[PDB]
Amino acid sequence: TIFSENEYNEIVEMLRDYSNDNLEFEVSFKNINYPNFMRITEHYINITPENKIESNNYLDISLIFPDKNVYRVSLFNQEQIGEFITKFSKASSNDISRYIVSLDPSDDIEIVYKNRKLIGIDNWAITIKSTEEIPLVAGKSKISKPKITGSERIMYRYKTRYSFTINKNSRIDITDVKSSPIIWKLMTVPSNYELELELINKIDINTLESELLNVFMIIQ
């Protein structure tokens, strides 16, 4: 047992709201270092079939607006990441945000616009987050893009994500992150290690408890 009486009940109300929308469900794991990262990657590589593993290297450009919502583009092509780093390393933030918004979604360009719940578990290093994430897919209709006042905040994140699909409803995401507010020496910046259990489809809280207990056996 991981959740208390009052945490359990509140997670059940987030699970129902998740299936009722572009709203996502993510259980974020705190205090992940390099030995943790590599131990999760090794363990999941052994038990997860090759057709359920997804290896990706990319750059996450996040524009943060005054009302705190994020516009995030994910550039998957290394050629495009390199062309970005060289053309904008000396440019203004207004020039960079106007370009990031100008991009149309390709297979190599993945766009998502957030619109704003958070629960932190007491004695466990986890945090349940539920945020409305609107993807602009381009094979379906795209929603209205946000207004650029010029006072936006940009956060660049070079990521090396390993996506392990466990069941038909859940997905483990262990990522090697290099966060920086500017573009220079980004790929030289020390690495942050992040672990997340993402739900692709809605599930029972007891099934969530089990899947979290599995991950905790490897971390500890």
Side-chain angles (χ1 to χ4, degrees), residues 1-115 117-220:
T1 313
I2 293 178
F3 314 125
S4 61
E5 166 91 316
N6 302 296
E7 282 168 356
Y8 187 111
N9 301 338
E10 188 53 62
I11 289 161
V12 180
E13 274 192 15
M14 271 166 95
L15 278 171
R16 203 193 167 216
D17 282 17
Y18 168 56
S19 40
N20 288 170
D21 209 340
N22 287 290
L23 192 52
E24 299 306 296
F25 202 96
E26 180 200 283
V27 186
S28 183
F29 290 76
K30 269 84 194 91
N31 201 203
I32 276 66
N33 322 300
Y34 176 70
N36 275 323
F37 172 74
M38 218 44 111
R39 214 190 296 177
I40 310 299
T41 315
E42 274 150 32
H43 178 252
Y44 278 117
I45 255 147
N46 300 330
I47 51 153
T48 313
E50 206 103 45
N51 297 314
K52 294 181 176 184
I53 305 176
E54 196 72 36
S55 184
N56 284 290
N57 286 280
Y58 61 109
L59 178 64
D60 260 340
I61 299 111
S62 283
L63 319 173
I64 311 166
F65 293 85
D67 50 353
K68 290 183 191 177
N69 10 37
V70 208
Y71 189 77
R72 197 183 76 214
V73 175
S74 295
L75 307 175
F76 287 90
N77 188 14
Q78 213 61 42
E79 181 210 58
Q80 201 169 24
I81 298 168
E83 280 162 16
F84 180 80
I85 294 175
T86 51
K87 283 173 191 171
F88 294 98
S89 64
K90 289 181 182 186
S92 62
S93 62
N94 207 133
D95 224 80
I96 303 167
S97 51
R98 276 181 175 145
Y99 169 72
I100 286 300
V101 176
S102 80
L103 288 168
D104 290 337
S106 307
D107 281 20
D108 289 17
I109 295 158
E110 188 183 280
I111 307 179
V112 76
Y113 183 50
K114 303 190 190 177
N115 266 306
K117 284 204 177 296
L118 193 81
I119 299 172
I121 288 76
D122 288 337
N123 289 343
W124 299 84
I126 42 177
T127 296
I128 319 291
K129 192 184 177 186
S130 189
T131 175
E132 201 201 356
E133 292 189 348
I134 298 178
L136 310 194
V137 206
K140 258 143 190 176
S141 48
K142 296 169 267 196
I143 278 159
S144 186
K145 297 186 177 184
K147 288 130 181 292
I148 287 141
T149 44
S151 58
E152 289 81 60
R153 297 169 182 225
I154 322 172
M155 192 79 91
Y156 310 88
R157 285 176 165 95
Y158 190 67
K159 294 185 173 195
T160 305
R161 174 182 277 187
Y162 287 99
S163 301
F164 303 96
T165 297
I166 322 167
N167 299 282
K168 304 180 183 178
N169 312 118
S170 46
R171 198 185 72 242
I172 267 289
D173 288 347
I174 351 145
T175 306
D176 168 19
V177 180
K178 295 186 173 201
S179 294
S180 175
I182 55 185
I183 304 170
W184 120 294
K185 293 280 199 182
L186 171 70
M187 294 181 58
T188 314
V189 162
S191 284
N192 301 277
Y193 295 103
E194 288 162 2
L195 182 46
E196 303 125 31
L197 176 62
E198 188 96 58
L199 299 192
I200 85 171
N201 291 311
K202 142 98 171 193
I203 48 153
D204 193 272
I205 197 193
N206 302 288
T207 314
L208 179 78
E209 278 243 286
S210 306
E211 280 179 23
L212 287 182
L213 275 170
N214 279 317
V215 189
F216 276 119
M217 282 202 272
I218 318 148
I219 290 176
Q220 294 158 0

